[PDB]
């Protein structure tokens, strides 16, 4: 996904904040990798960029790795407005504001978390092999696919 | 519950070797440093002989 530049630190085990508390919490025990990169040259424009929404008001602490797409009326006070989009029961869905003139802390950053799930099932996704260089006219060990 | 046994250890036990230490086990990447709580399970548990 894509977040603001100032909140790229909140995504970490134990670290809380705005997106780490109500939007996306990473568990304390995690064996993947979090990475981000600035994308101010292909996701920004001088017109008012509101194509990226985010939630700021939630019921309680969001469980790590959970999807909450419900749009129920938030309750910020003790008045039961009964879902009328009035005072103290605002709509808990807002959007960011990205401008090409803001500071680096307010620039959009595209992040991606790669969670590496290990299981008792046979391992499927792995990396390449050695594939070392080949020297000729010399007594060496060949280690081809089926002929060692 | 008067018989204990080890379930968590780093490596396999060497033939004819007794493990008397009780260092806490680390199942994750968090530096527990001897708290014995979440993700820091105790290496010695008890049986249940009913």
């Amino acid at each position, epitope marked *: 996904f894509v977040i603001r530049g100032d909140e790229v630190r909140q995504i970490a085990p134990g670290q809380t904040g705005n997106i780490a508390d109500y939007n996306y919490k990473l*568990p304390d*025990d*995690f*064996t*993947g990798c979090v990475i981000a990169w600035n994308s101010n040259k292909l996701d920004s424009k001088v017109s008012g960029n509101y194509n990226y929404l985010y939630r700021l008001f939630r019921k309680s602490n969001l*469980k*790590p*790795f*959970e999807r909450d797409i419900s749009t129920e009326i938030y309750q910020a006070g003790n008045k039961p407005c009964n879902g009328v989009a009035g005072f103290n029961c605002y709509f808990p869905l807002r959007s960011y504001s990205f401008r090409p003139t803001y500071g680096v802390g307010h620039q959009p950053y595209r992040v991606v978390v790669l*969670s*590496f*799930e*290990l*299981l*008792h*099932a046979p391992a499927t996704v792995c990396g390449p092999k050695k594939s070392t260089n080949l020297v000729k006219n010399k007594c060496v060990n060949f280690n081809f696919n089926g002929l060692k | 519950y008067n018989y204990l046994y080890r379930l*968590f250890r780093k490596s396999n036990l060497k033939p004819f070797e007794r493990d008397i230490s009780t260092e806490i086990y680390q*199942a*994750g990447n968090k530096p527990c440093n001897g708290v014995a709580g979440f*993700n820091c*399970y105790f290496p010695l548990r008890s049986y249940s002989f009913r």
Partner: nanobody
Amino acid sequence: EVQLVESGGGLVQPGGSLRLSCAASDFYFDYYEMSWVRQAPGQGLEWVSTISGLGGATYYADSVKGRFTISRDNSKNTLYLQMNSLRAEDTALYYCATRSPFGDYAFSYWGQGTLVTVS
């Protein structure tokens, strides 16, 4: 501080079915990995299946590809194992285990176990 509760049957006809319901309580079953481990009399433990909690993919073993199915429920924290096409070679003690995918290779802790007979 953390325990497991299992349930099910004790005797199944060789060719019928059985309702196995592992009932967990106070678990972080959203990003944890819960599966079943069989214990046949005379040999050690064997892996049966696995149910991912991140995406929801269910993996099976080599000999139970087209005879087992698992239904995971998150409303009351219970799992259903509908075992079909049973024969006399499935005698084992089933254990409902739960571990963390972002940890070691071995499970954290098991339950009390359930015994079934098929012959």
